[PDB]
């Protein structure tokens, strides 16, 4: 028992101290394997939580995505529909990040692609924070709302990024993408206050304000 909980904390630190992408992923796969040694729902929740943190402190999109596929795989094996939803969203934000980087690569001077990219980063961070909050406090109305926020934020970014690729160098399209970036950033800020302050009401107050914004930018961008 304690030999497991202690080991989760150790491997997590090892991953954060790793010096190459290949070592991070090897440690990550060792964290996931510890799930095999237990059926305790809390040990898997803690492992998923550590995976989200390893991902949140990484910058390589490919690595992040691989970390999150593991986290989703664990949630799915648990039958935990709620935690799997959160991991799958973050995973999808990471895949959008990979796509956003490809878009910019084809037209690196394109300010629309740059803004789309910045928007996805903020969306990814918002979804990762929600996952961190849920992984520790499933019953929270803030965690669940945070997941809902990150969902809305990502929908808006996808619409904004859709135009950055479709019709760029156009004032009309350039405004949504600017709004989407701002929307994603605020969503990331809201989800952060909630992550460090789950039970706080000011935390719950911030999450709600960002969804309306997220919802408005989605409706704004679909227009363009």
């Amino acid at each position: 028992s304690e030999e497991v909980n202690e080991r989760v904390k150790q491997l997590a630190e090892k991953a954060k101290e790793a010096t190459d992408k290949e070592e991070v992923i090897e440690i990550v796969k060792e964290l996931a394997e510890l799930a095999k040694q237990s059926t305790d729902p809390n040990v898997v929740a803690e492992i998923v939580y550590q995976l989200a943190e390893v991902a949140e402190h990484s910058t390589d999109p490919e690595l992040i995505k691989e970390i999150l596929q593991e986290a989703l795989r664990l949630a799915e094996e648990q039958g935990d529909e709620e935690l799997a939803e959160a991991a799958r969203l973050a995973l999808k934000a990471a895949r959008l990040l990979e796509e956003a980087r490809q878009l910019l690569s084809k037209d690196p001077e394109n300010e629309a692609a740059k803004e789309c990219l910045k928007a996805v980063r903020a969306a990814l961070e918002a979804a990762l924070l929600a996952l961190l909050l849920l992984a520790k406090h499933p019953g929270s109305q803030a965690a669940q709302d945070a997941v809902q926020l990150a969902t809305a934020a990502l929908r808006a970014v996808e619409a904004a990024c859709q135009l950055a690729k479709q019709y760029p160098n156009s004032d009309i399209a350039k405004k949504c993408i600017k709004a989407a970036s701002e929307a994603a950033e605020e969503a990331s800020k809201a989800a952060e206050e909630a992550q460090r302050h789950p039970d706080s009401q000011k935390a719950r107050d911030e999450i709600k304000e960002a969804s309306q914004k997220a919802e408005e930018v989605k409706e704004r961008c679909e227009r363009a």
Side-chain angles (χ1 to χ4, degrees), residues 1 4 7-8 10-12 15-20 23-28 30-32 34-35 37-72 74-76 78-80 82-100 102 104-105 107-117 119-120 122-140 142-144 146-147 149-154 156-164 168 173 176-177 179-184 186-188 190-192 194-195 197-198 203 207 210-211 214 217 220-221 223-224:
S1 168
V4 155
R7 194 66 191 158
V8 179
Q10 286 155 41
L11 299 161
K16 301 181 216 200
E17 299 174 332
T19 54
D20 61 290
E23 186 65 23
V24 173
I25 184 68
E26 172 50 64
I27 299 167
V28 162
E30 285 169 33
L31 266 170
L34 272 175
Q37 284 185 48
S38 192
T39 59
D40 192 323
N42 291 322
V43 172
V44 177
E46 177 61 14
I47 290 174
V48 164
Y49 172 78
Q50 291 300 338
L51 294 180
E53 256 180 13
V54 177
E56 199 270 5
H57 300 81
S58 302
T59 50
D60 173 61
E62 180 50 55
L63 182 72
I64 291 161
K65 155 166 153 179
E66 293 187 359
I67 299 171
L68 290 174
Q69 270 171 346
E70 291 285 6
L72 173 57
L74 293 175
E76 280 171 350
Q78 277 291 125
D80 189 322
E82 290 76 14
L83 187 55
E85 184 201 343
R88 188 159 32 240
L89 179 70
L91 172 58
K92 183 154 105 121
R95 294 157 63 201
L96 182 57
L97 180 53
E98 287 192 313
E99 182 189 350
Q102 274 309 120
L104 187 54
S105 289
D107 218 49
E109 314 211 348
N110 191 316
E111 283 295 334
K114 298 189 207 170
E115 282 290 325
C116 160
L117 176 55
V120 182
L124 175 57
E125 180 67 14
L128 281 169
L129 290 161
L131 176 63
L132 294 165
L133 188 52
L134 201 164
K136 280 259 160 149
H137 301 331
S140 169
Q144 296 179 22
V147 172
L149 167 58
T151 307
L154 192 73
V157 171
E158 288 173 325
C161 287
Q162 163 55 13
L163 285 150
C176 159
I177 306 165
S181 172
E182 285 160 75
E186 182 180 330
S188 182
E192 180 172 13
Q195 201 280 321
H197 291 336
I207 299 180
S211 298
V217 181
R220 184 207 173 104
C221 221
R223 211 163 279 123

